[PDB]
Amino acid sequence: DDFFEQEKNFLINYYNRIKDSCVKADKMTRSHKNVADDYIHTAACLHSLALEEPTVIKKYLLKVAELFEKLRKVEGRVSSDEDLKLTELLRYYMLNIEAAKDLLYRRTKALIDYENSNKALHQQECCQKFEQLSESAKEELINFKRKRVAAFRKNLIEMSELEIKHARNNVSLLQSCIDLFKNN
Amino acid sequence: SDIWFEEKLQEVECEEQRLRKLHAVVETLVNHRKELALNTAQFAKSLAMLGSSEDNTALSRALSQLAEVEEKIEQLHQEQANNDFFLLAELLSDYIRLLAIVRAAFDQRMKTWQRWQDAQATLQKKREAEARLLWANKPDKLQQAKDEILEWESRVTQYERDFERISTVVRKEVIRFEKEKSKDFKNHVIKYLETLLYSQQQLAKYWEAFLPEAKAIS
């Protein structure tokens, strides 16, 4: 059965690809919250700068500082949802791969046990035990693949919806502000 | 004495402080957004590699497509950062450059005033030089002193008139800086705000196009 052979190579390689994309997703999200921090830090300087100033513009500054205070809320939200849908998904299956790896390790162990009794013959149980594991192993590994495809599609869909939600939110927020100034 | 100059100089020096504050904060925002675009570029690459490492064709397709989305987003991040820096961050540096121009005006006013005061000190020595010669027995040197007093009498008159004009230029400059602000500030702000609106509009379209690809995962 070459299924457990190719499966061994796939899991080993995919784990490194999963771990790599996990740390990269984390760094990206963390950089998002950084930009989110500057948003509130900028709205503060804007609000503090609009104090002493002619009244004509003074009101204009308070509208942009109020805008940045809200934009910082959406940026911190997209970073959170980004960590939950992407980074967490890669996290989950980085450990899930390690579990499937352990399954293959145990199966091969029981295989050598049957391989030993296969070279002697009165304890052929190593053969029955090897098949009790080889069957459940392939049954679980295939169960893993099916669960991984649904998880990726589930998160990829939800993330897309959330990204569109915040994107439209910021568009309306900015839009109202621009249309407000254009029509003083 | 006129308190307006001593007071207005404080308002100007204080506003410049608030400008440098907001400017420095924006500089960190530009870098942080540049730092984000870089991390996004790295993530986009890792995604494509993951899609290739995948054994499920559908997942490889979706993953590869997701990387393309991230590839477009990282560009928006960089252009946004570039738009931040140039539009918003060079907007601040210019005003800080104009504020320093009015500060130099106040400094130049003190210079002219100082030279005007220095001329006043030079005149007293002339009058004193004549007082000492009034008792001497040399009418020639006396007229020499009376002449230098006449000359410096007009000199201090010139420095005094210069201080009056220089004090008027600073007043004309401050009004020019204020009127120019309210006339162009609103537009410059809208220009940058539109740069953020365009980015958001691009983000939505990016994900709205990927959403059908995610649902198509079988």
Author numbering:
A (entry chain C): 206 to 326, 342 to 404
B (entry chain A): 305 to 522
From the paper:
To understand the molecular basis for heterodimerization between ESCPE-1 protomers and its membrane tubulation activity, we determined the crystal structure of SNX1BAR–SNX5BAR (where BAR stands for the BAR domains of both proteins) at 2.5 Å resolution. The structure forms an antiparallel dimer of three-helix bundles with a curvature that would fit a circle with a diameter of ~32 nm. Electron density at the tip of SNX5BAR is very weak, indicating flexibility of this region. Unlike other SNX-BAR homodimers, the SNX1BAR–SNX5BAR heterodimer exhibits asymmetry on its surface properties, general shape, and the associated PX domains located at either side of the BAR heterodimer. The interface buries a large area of 5,114 Å2, of which 78% corresponds to polar surface. From this analysis, we found that two clusters formed by F347 and W511 in SNX1, and F273 and F401 in SNX5, have the highest binding energy. Yet, only F347 and W511 in SNX1 are conserved, indicating that these residues likely form a binding hot spot. SNX1BAR and SNX5BAR exhibit complementary polarity at their distal and proximal interfaces. Consistent with previous predictions, the central region of SNX5BAR has a negative patch, whereas the equivalent region in SNX1BAR is neutral. The crystal structure of the SNX1BAR–SNX5BAR complex presented here, together with analytical modeling, revealed that SNX1 comprises a hydrophobic binding hot spot compatible with homodimerization and heterodimerization, whereas SNX5 uses distinct patches of polar residues to preclude homodimerization and enhance heterodimerization.
